[PDB]
Amino acid sequence: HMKRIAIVGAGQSGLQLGLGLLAAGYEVTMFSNRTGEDIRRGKVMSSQCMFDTSLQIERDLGLDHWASDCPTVDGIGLAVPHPEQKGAKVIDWAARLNASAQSVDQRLKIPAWMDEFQKKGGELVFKDAGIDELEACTQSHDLTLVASGKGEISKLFERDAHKSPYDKPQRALALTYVKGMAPREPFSAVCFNLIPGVGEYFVFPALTTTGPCEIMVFEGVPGGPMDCWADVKTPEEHLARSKWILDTFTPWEAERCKDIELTDDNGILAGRFAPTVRKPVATLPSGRKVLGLADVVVLNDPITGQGSNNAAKCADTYLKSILARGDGAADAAWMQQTFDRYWFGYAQWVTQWTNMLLAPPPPHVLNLLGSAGAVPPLASAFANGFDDPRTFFPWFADAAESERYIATCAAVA
Amino acid sequence: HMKRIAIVGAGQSGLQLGLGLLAAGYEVTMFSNRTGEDIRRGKVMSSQCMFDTSLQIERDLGLDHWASDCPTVDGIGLAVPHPEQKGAKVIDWAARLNASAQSVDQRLKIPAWMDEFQKKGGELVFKDAGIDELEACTQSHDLTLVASGKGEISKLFERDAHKSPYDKPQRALALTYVKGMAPREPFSAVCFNLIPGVGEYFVFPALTTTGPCEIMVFEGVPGGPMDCWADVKTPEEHLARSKWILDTFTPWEAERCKDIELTDDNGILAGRFAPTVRKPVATLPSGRKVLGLADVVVLNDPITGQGSNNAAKCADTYLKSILARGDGAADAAWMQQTFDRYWFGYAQWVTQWTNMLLAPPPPHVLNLLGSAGAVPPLASAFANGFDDPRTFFPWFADAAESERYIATCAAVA
Numbered sequence: 171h172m173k174r175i176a177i178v179g180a181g182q183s184g185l186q187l188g189l190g191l192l193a194a195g196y197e198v199t200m201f202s203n204r205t206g207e208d209i210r211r212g213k214v215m216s217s218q219c220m221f222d223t224s225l226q227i228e229r230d231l232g233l234d235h236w237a238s239d240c241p242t243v244d245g246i247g248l249a250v251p252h253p254e255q256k257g258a259k260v261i262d263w264a265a266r267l268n269a270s271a272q273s274v275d276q277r278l279k280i281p282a283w284m285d286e287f288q289k290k291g292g293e294l295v296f297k298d299a300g301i302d303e304l305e306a307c308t309q310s311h312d313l314t315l316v317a318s319g320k321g322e323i324s325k326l327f328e329r330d331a332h333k334s335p336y337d338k339p340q341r342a343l344a345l346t347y348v349k350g351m352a353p354r355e356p357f358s359a360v361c362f363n364l365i366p367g368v369g370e371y372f373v374f375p376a377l378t379t380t381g382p383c384e385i386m387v388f389e390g391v392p393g394g395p396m397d398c399w400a401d402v403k404t405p406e407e408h409l410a411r412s413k414w415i416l417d418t419f420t421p422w423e424a425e426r427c428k429d430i431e432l433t434d435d436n437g438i439l440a441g442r443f444a445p446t447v448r449k450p451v452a453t454l455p456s457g458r459k460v461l462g463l464a465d466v467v468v469l470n471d472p473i474t475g476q477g478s479n480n481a482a483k484c485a486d487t488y489l490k491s492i493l494a495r496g497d498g499a500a501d502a503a504w505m506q507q508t509f510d511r512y513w514f515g516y517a518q519w520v521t522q523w524t525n526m527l528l529a530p531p532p533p534h535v536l537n538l539l540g541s542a543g544a545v546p547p548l549a550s551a552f553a554n555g556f557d558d559p560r561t562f563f564p565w566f567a568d569a570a571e572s573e574r575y576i577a578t579c580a581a582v583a
Numbered sequence: 584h585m586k587r588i589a590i591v592g593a594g595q596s597g598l599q600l601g602l603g604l605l606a607a608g609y610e611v612t613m614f615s616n617r618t619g620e621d622i623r624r625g626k627v628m629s630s631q632c633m634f635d636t637s638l639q640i641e642r643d644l645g646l647d648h649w650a651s652d653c654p655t656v657d658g659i660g661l662a663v664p665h666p667e668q669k670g671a672k673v674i675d676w677a678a679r680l681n682a683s684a685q686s687v688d689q690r691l692k693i694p695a696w697m698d699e700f701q702k703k704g705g706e707l708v709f710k711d712a713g714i715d716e717l718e719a720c721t722q723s724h725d726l727t728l729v730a731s732g733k734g735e736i737s738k739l740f741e742r743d744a745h746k747s748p749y750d751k752p753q754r755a756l757a758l759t760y761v762k763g764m765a766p767r768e769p770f771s772a773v774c775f776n777l778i779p780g781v782g783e784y785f786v787f788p789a790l791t792t793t794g795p796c797e798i799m800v801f802e803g804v805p806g807g808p809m810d811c812w813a814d815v816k817t818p819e820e821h822l823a824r825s826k827w828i829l830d831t832f833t834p835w836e837a838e839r840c841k842d843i844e845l846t847d848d849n850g851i852l853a854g855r856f857a858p859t860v861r862k863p864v865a866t867l868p869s870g871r872k873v874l875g876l877a878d879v880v881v882l883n884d885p886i887t888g889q890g891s892n893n894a895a896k897c898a899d900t901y902l903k904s905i906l907a908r909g910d911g912a913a914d915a916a917w918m919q920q921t922f923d924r925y926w927f928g929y930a931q932w933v934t935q936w937t938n939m940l941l942a943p944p945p946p947h948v949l950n951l952l953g954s955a956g957a958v959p960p961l962a963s964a965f966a967n968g969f970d971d972p973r974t975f976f977p978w979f980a981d982a983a984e985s986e987r988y989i990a991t992c993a994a995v996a
């Protein structure tokens with residue numbers, strides 16, 4: 171009678187997909203390796219800035235439960251320190267987003283969606299799932315998906331070397347969730363601070379388990395002055411190192427932080443990983459097959475702020491493919507084509523752009539970013555491209571095309 | 584109080600946009616150069632095969648008025664004549680679409696949407712609009728759009744030479760709407776017949792003013808054996824020349840046509856045009872500005888079946904941009920950014936792919952099309968790519984990437 175879907179991994183993409191499937195009349199089994207409460211009170215996992223298109227995917231499913239309470243992010247700003255004048259910027263501009271972005275802590279969203287999943291009839295099973303659970307799921311369900319993010323079981327899927335130009339981390343990452351930051355005026359924004367040869371500091375308002383906050387995101391070229399977390403062993407030390415980066419590299423941002431505190435002692439993170447794309451179909455010892463979802467198959471560095479946007483868009487594409495398939499077999503071909511539509515239609519572009527941004531920038535890029543400060547339509551294109559990075563091609567990557575786009579923008583300024 | 588939008592040109596994109604704007608509470612003025620009835624009873628304009636994503640845009644607006652009555656197109660087929668054996672094919676395969684396509688004659692859809700537009704409160708003005716009407720609209724409306732398709736006033740917009748690699752027609756076109764064709768079994772499809780060095784014949788079921796039909800689409804390399812319409816001066820002669828092409832080049836299709844008749848004497852068309860992209864902002868003598876929509880700014884050869892899909896997607900992107908803008912100015916910068924989002928996010932890919940397909944194919948393409956006949960997942964990717972041609976990049980265009988995609992497909996077959 172009823173089609174039955176198993177999802178291993180209770181994360182953003184898995185739960186969005188599972189909730190959509192329940193609403194469409196499927197039976198859904200989901201495995202989680204943590205309780206909701208331990209997720210709420212555990213370490214942060216991301217900075218999860220979702221732009222309008224991803225937000226709308228959630229709205230269309232009825233899952234925008236924090237829309238009113240979560241602060242809106244209304245623009246993007248970009249600043250570059252002056253090579254000469256201390257504490258001055260040589261580039262400093264901003265542009266409004268055509269529609270707001272929002273960052274709802276996954277510590278809030280994932281547990282609440284787990285609650286909703288059970289209320290809507292999903293079967294939530296608690297276990298650190300392994301091969302045995304995948305073998306069991308594939309015998310009792312029409313389709314089994316792995317949605318375990320950066321978890322170890324994700325390595326069941328073969329690395330796709332041609333889609334993975336990097337095999338090492340390209341940035342040392344850290345997150346710091348704080349209260350008390352002076353609000354940005356006259357509108358909120360993701361404040362991008364690009365430190366040439368050193369790294370990046372991004373900061374924006376968000377909602378966490380103690381209410382509204384701002385999230386500080388730090389990325390450092392490995393071995394550089396912002397690869398600076400190895401000796402940090404306490405929350406107090408993490409807050410202090412966060413303020414040290416701002417004092418040292420972005421004193422204009424330190425002026426907003428004279429009174430910041432951590433939201434909670436678990437509102438901190440540091441780590442690193444190599445960008446990786448994996449093949450989406452994994453074969454179990456039995457010969458049965460499972461399909462990878464979102465970060466299991468496409469894992470990008472957070473520098474472009476796309477992971478949670480990718481997660482929403484991936485789960486949307488997979489849900490649409492399931493609903494269209496009907497009673498057709500969920501075989502390896504269908505699985506692969508489902509991933510291919512996500513990859514070739516969308517994620518290949520997000521991934522190529524993110525991987526290029528991790529490398530040292532060519533000269534036409536500096537000209538582009540500086541020109542944006544004098545050409546508001548170009549600044550606007552930069553800001554709104556974060557909602558659909560396909561719109562950056564080819565002009566972000568090619569000098570001649572970048573000059574042509576600057577000219578188009580200047581002509582309507 | 585109310586924002587007011589003028590649209591010059593009562594075509595598919597203009598009417599979809601106008602109806603969406605009325606539903607959102609805007610005042611809309613629209614200019615048409617023909618009455619609804621003369622459109623219904625006049626010459627056909629297109630073959631308007633719309634794939635699922637475009638169909639869903641219409642559904643989401645409540646405009647899928649023919650969904651139940653229009654025959655569904657459930658797949659794509661590809662056939663290539665054998666160079667040796669007479670009347671045989673060396674390639675002949677098909678694949679199912681993940682969701683049906685539909686072709687509702689614009690002679691039906693445009694007049695019915697004009698009726699709906701008036702019923703929903705739009706102001707429909709009948710005049711062959713010129714500069715004077717654009718000058719008048721721009722004084723009395725917040726935003727004026729030109730949606731006149733292949734009409735002469737579209738030339739108010741400057742040709743974009745960098746986005747327009749062609750300045751001459753690349754195919755001699757013809758359309759023939761017929762009754763009596765044997766239905767394709769066991770499922771309907773767009774039957775692609777590629778005649779190397781000569782042209783293309785496509786055929787699929789559709790709905791017109793006399794009910795269900797099939798549409799024959801002919802494209803001929805200029806000066807070749809299928810550039811064969813210049814001496815056709817009557818409907819009877821047009822039907823006969825249509826059957827001659829099938830008898831001569833695709834006798835397997837002629838077997839379905841032993842009993843075909845025209846749906847009506849105006850169910851025929853022949854012509855040609857150069858693919859053209861235009862700059863989207865036009866400046867009137869007064870200095871006020873107007874924004875071009877759909878075929879006014881991006882006009883592709885029909886060979887890839889995308890014009891009406893582009894029209895729906897363009898009007899969707901423009902409607903979303905208007906709704907997000909609120910009371911912000913509809914200035915040249917906003918106009919340009921609205922087009923840019925359509926172009927860089929979507930249409931640049933449809934356009935580049937369509938323009939490459941008009942040129943003689945490189946060897947890796949023949950290998951790809953032949954391999955699809957032995958690799959069903961690749962045939963499926965080919966078919967479903969017509970719903971989002973971004974999914975064809977880069978593997979349709981690059982030999983090495985084409986070989987990699989064939990390998991991915993063969994591994995899950």
Ligand SMILES: Cc1cc2nc3c(=O)[nH]c(=O)nc-3n(C[C@H](O)[C@H](O)[C@H](O)COP(=O)(O)OP(=O)(O)OC[C@H]3O[C@@H](n4cnc5c(N)ncnc54)[C@H](O)[C@@H]3O)c2cc1C
Nearest residue numbers: 179181182183216217218219318319321464465477478479
């Ligand atoms: C520092 C940092 C900052 C980021 N900032 C942003 C940002 O600003 N914007 C943005 O869009 N993205 C951002 N991201 C990325 C984004 O958070 C992720 O890409 C997103 O969470 C991916 O969703 P997912 O559903 O694939 O995985 P997740 O949401 O991580 O879900 C995976 C879940 O599976 C569980 N799991 C693992 N193994 C198992 C197992 N064996 N059995 C059962 N369950 C298991 C895990 O516990 C976890 O809860 C950031 C990431 C990092 C690291």
Ligand SMILES: Cc1cc2nc3c(=O)[nH]c(=O)nc-3n(C[C@H](O)[C@H](O)[C@H](O)COP(=O)(O)OP(=O)(O)OC[C@H]3O[C@@H](n4cnc5c(N)ncnc54)[C@H](O)[C@@H]3O)c2cc1C
Nearest residue numbers: 592594595596629630631632731732734877878890891892
């Ligand atoms: C032979 C052929 C086959 C095709 N087959 C397909 C297919 O299979 N699939 C597909 O998706 N697309 C196909 N197309 C393309 C598709 O039909 C068009 O791209 C689509 O109609 C574009 O919509 P539009 O709204 O931009 O223009 P239209 O829908 O053409 O609307 C333009 C309207 O503006 C009116 N107008 C012109 N000048 C003025 C003026 N001065 N004042 C007022 N009104 C004016 C015109 O009379 C017309 O009604 C085909 C095209 C051709 C020529």
Ligand SMILES: c1ccc2[nH]ccc2c1
Nearest residue numbers: 250251252253254260366
């Ligand atoms: C170019 C522009 C700005 C810069 N700040 C520090 C180095 C450097 C180089």
Ligand SMILES: c1ccc2[nH]ccc2c1
Nearest residue numbers: 393394395396397398399
């Ligand atoms: C190790 C790594 C990074 C650092 N930045 C400043 C001091 C320092 C030490």
Ligand SMILES: c1ccc2[nH]ccc2c1
Nearest residue numbers: 219360372472473474475
């Ligand atoms: C939005 C945009 C870019 C970003 N980089 C890191 C976090 C983040 C959020």
Ligand SMILES: c1ccc2[nH]ccc2c1
Nearest residue numbers: 173312313495498499500
């Ligand atoms: C994806 C594809 C086909 C399917 N048949 C039953 C469930 C299911 C999921």
Ligand SMILES: c1ccc2[nH]ccc2c1
Nearest residue numbers: 362364370473474527531
């Ligand atoms: C966002 C993130 C990193 C970047 N490096 C250069 C531009 C840029 C934008």
Ligand SMILES: c1ccc2[nH]ccc2c1
Nearest residue numbers: 526527529530531535567
């Ligand atoms: C193109 C290539 C490499 C790059 N690194 C940062 C921006 C950028 C653009």
Ligand SMILES: c1ccc2[nH]ccc2c1
Nearest residue numbers: 527535538552562565566
């Ligand atoms: C992020 C977004 C767009 C961009 N264009 C050039 C560099 C770059 C970085």
Ligand SMILES: c1ccc2[nH]ccc2c1
Nearest residue numbers: 663664665666667673779
């Ligand atoms: C290659 C394949 C098929 C063909 N039919 C006619 C010429 C030709 C060339």
Ligand SMILES: c1ccc2[nH]ccc2c1
Nearest residue numbers: 806807808809810811812
């Ligand atoms: C002119 C053009 C094309 C043609 N195909 C067959 C005869 C003929 C004449």
Ligand SMILES: c1ccc2[nH]ccc2c1
Nearest residue numbers: 632773785885886887888
């Ligand atoms: C669908 C797909 C391709 C096509 N080429 C011409 C008409 C047509 C319809």
Ligand SMILES: c1ccc2[nH]ccc2c1
Nearest residue numbers: 586725726908911912913
């Ligand atoms: C597009 C953009 C801004 C606008 N303000 C009023 C109407 C309108 C349309």
Ligand SMILES: c1ccc2[nH]ccc2c1
Nearest residue numbers: 775777783886887940944
């Ligand atoms: C559709 C239309 C034209 C084409 N030429 C080669 C492949 C192909 C597909």
Ligand SMILES: c1ccc2[nH]ccc2c1
Nearest residue numbers: 939940942943944948980
């Ligand atoms: C790449 C380049 C040119 C082409 N002509 C027909 C198919 C095709 C693909």
Ligand SMILES: c1ccc2[nH]ccc2c1
Nearest residue numbers: 940948951965975978979
């Ligand atoms: C149409 C669609 C996809 C394609 N891949 C190679 C040629 C070609 C034509």
